[PDB]
């Protein structure tokens, strides 16, 4: 289970503003970020031009926003525990 996804968007080294954008969509775990594609996010005003830049910075790590798709969220790695 990618630790960057399990970590709360608030944990992002970026200012809370970065997480506030995605979090505004009721998102607390970066994992949800990979659940939705950036396009679906760019189609919402809640995101600001500056917020997009912060996403690219975190996306540079390729740890989140890799356009992945999860059926629920907890990968086989997390398993029951």
């Amino acid at each position: 289970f990618d630790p960057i996804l399990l970590r709360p968007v608030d944990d992002l080294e970026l200012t809370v503003r970065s997480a506030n954008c995605l979090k505004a969509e009721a998102i607390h775990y970066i994992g949800d970020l990979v659940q939705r594609t950036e396009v679906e996010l760019l189609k919402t005003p809640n995101l600001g031009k500056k917020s997009l830049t912060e996403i690219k910075d975190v996306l540079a790590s390729r740890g989140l926003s890799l356009g992945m798709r999860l059926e629920n969220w907890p990968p086989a790695s997390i398993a029951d525990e």
């Binding site: 760019l42 005003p45 809640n46 600001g48 917020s51």
Partner: protein, 70 residues
Amino acid sequence: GDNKPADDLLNLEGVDRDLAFKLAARGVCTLEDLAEQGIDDLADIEGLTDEKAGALIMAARNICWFGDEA
């Protein structure tokens, strides 16, 4: 500053001259500048609502990103 709305912002669909003036009052002048504003920046004006402000942001951004296509 008069902050007059540019033809692009005034020619934006879903926005009237009154709304274009209020949005331009925030230094915005071209539809592109309007897209730079965020839903929180639009809340500054009561005339605009968080839902209506966001709809204007995507509409303006869509025009720029989809401006290549008629």
